[PDB]
């Protein structure tokens, strides 16, 4: 039971965008990577604000009336606004389409970056299950789990214990 | 003993379109297209407009007797005019260069 | 008795969103007129929860 990011998201992760789930002797639970959530929240907020705040426009006017014998000038004004309508509409559509695809890729990179940090810490003291989870080859008590999530897990501390558990699997 | 890396999910029914996929469910979104108006005629940066009641702009400027007289110094951000004003040019005749005059008097300090 | 930064003849657009599909003509500090029905930016993640 309980799988990782390869098979989808977690409804139980409520205190952050990215996080971890653990299981050992002392229990189980979800825990968000607060710092990674912080860094991504700033990036998404900045992107939305940049798309919004950069629209610094000249004063808009509705004075577009010409006299009765100047219908050709009125048509020129009509097609000028048609041209800008086409320009803004097309650019706005593809802006949202492009950014939405990149935003989803941005979340995927952040999730993958947490997965790589844990993978390089555990090295061969754990087995990558291929579903976003790791099979710790040693007892990992609650202090050990916190060290992994804080980036302070020691490879050589559990190295001997993991080696004996690995040769049993072989 | 296991540790997993995962991400956030919820019950949001919101979907967004990407350049590669359509109707992708997302946990949160933000619209950048304003689709609603309050249906009111308002002040513009705290500057009141000029209400013509039922008079056309030439009628108000020239002083049609059925139109309110400008008794005091005033200012306006824009001029609001009825689509079919009741009181216009009461004495038949063309008002010259109305469009050019609008550029001068629509926004005054 | 209202105050807006953008005004149209059918209603005021009191919005700082960069785009609007309400009315072609307006006055003031206004969003750019577009014919798009929706412009929704994704901010969260792909909502594909495990079963």
């Amino acid at each position, epitope marked *: 039971a309980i799988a990782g990011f390869i098979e989808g998201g977690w409804q139980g992760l409520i*205190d952050g965008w990215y996080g971890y789930h653990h299981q050992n002797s002392e229990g189980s639970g979800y825990a968000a990577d607060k710092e990674a959530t912080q860094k991504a929240v700033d990036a998404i907020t900045t992107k939305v604000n940049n798309i919004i705040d950069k629209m610094n426009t000249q004063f808009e006017s509705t004075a577009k009336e010409f006299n009765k014998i100047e219908m050709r000038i009125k048509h020129l004004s009509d097609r000028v606004d048609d041209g800008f309508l086409d320009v803004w509409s097309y650019n706005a559509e593809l802006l949202v389409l492009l950014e939405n695809e990149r935003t989803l890729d941005f979340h995927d990179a952040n999730v993958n970056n947490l997965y790589q940090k844990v993978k390089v810490q555990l090295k061969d003291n754990a087995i990558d299950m291929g579903n976003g989870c790791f099979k710790i080859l040693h007892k990992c008590n609650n202090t050990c789990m916190d060290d992994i999530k804080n980036g302070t897990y020691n490879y050589y501390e559990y190295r001997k214990e993991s080696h004996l558990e690995k040769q049993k699997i072989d | 003993d296991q540790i997993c890396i995962g991400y956030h999910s919820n019950n949001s029914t919101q979907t967004v379109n990407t350049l590669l996929e359509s109707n992708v469910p997302v946990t949160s979104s933000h619209s950048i297209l304003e689709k609603e108006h309050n249906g009111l005629l308002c002040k513009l940066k705290g500057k009141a407009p000029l209400d013509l009641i039922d008079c056309s702009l030439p009628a108000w400027l020239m002083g049609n007797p059925k139109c309110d007289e400008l008794l005091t110094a005033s200012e306006w951000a824009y001029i609001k005019e009825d689509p079919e004003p009741e009181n216009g040019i009461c004495f038949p005749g063309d008002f010259d260069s109305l469009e050019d005059l609008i550029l001068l008097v629509s926004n005054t300090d | 008795d209202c105050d807006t930064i953008c005004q149209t003849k059918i209603g005021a657009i009191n919005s700082t969103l960069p785009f609007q599909n309400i009315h072609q003509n307006a006055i003031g500090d206004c969003p750019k007129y577009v014919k798009a029905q929706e412009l929704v930016l994704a901010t969260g993640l792909r909502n594909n929860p495990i079963k």
Partner: antibody
Amino acid sequence: QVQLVESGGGVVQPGRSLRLSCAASGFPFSSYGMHWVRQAPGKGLEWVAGVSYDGSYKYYADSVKGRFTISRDSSKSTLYLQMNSLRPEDTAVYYCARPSAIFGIYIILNGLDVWGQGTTVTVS
Amino acid sequence: EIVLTQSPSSVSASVGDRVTITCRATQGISSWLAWYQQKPGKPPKLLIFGASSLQSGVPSRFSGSGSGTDFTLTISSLQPEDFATYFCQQAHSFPLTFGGGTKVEIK
């Protein structure tokens, strides 16, 4: 409708113990982390403790470490602060504060949008 | 510990004035700053989060700006009900820390 209610404060001799209670209503109390913030008379605001939504993770300021214990009751929607070995410098008005959520996630590190009236603890 | 230095410790002004209060951090806190308004005997009220975002139900005369180390809270046109003490709070990391405080008082 959404507001907290602190209780349990009072006059207490040095070295004694008190337990504060923060009764929450109007919002999903079990989704938010919670914090305790105290204010000495005439002084500024000092954060003392915080706890995650599920109670698994707890954070303490150095000034109350080893003496204060935060905790919560999911079924009662109540937050607790057990205060041991009380000192005159612990005298303050104690608030329970809710961190703000953003983008739909209840991040514990944020601004504090909801506070109670506070309860007064006087150590002398 | 991230320490927030608030300036000025106090200031006197009249109604309609423009009031500037600054908050300085020892290290980068990105956008995780908050501004609070506190009347005597009452709990603090959240005014600004994200160092610039206006909290729902707060007049638009309150504005915040800044990123990383230096932040500013501005009251464009003071009102009678704005005379209080104001605090800046960081939300970057534990422990949560507050500024020394700024009392806005009548002259």
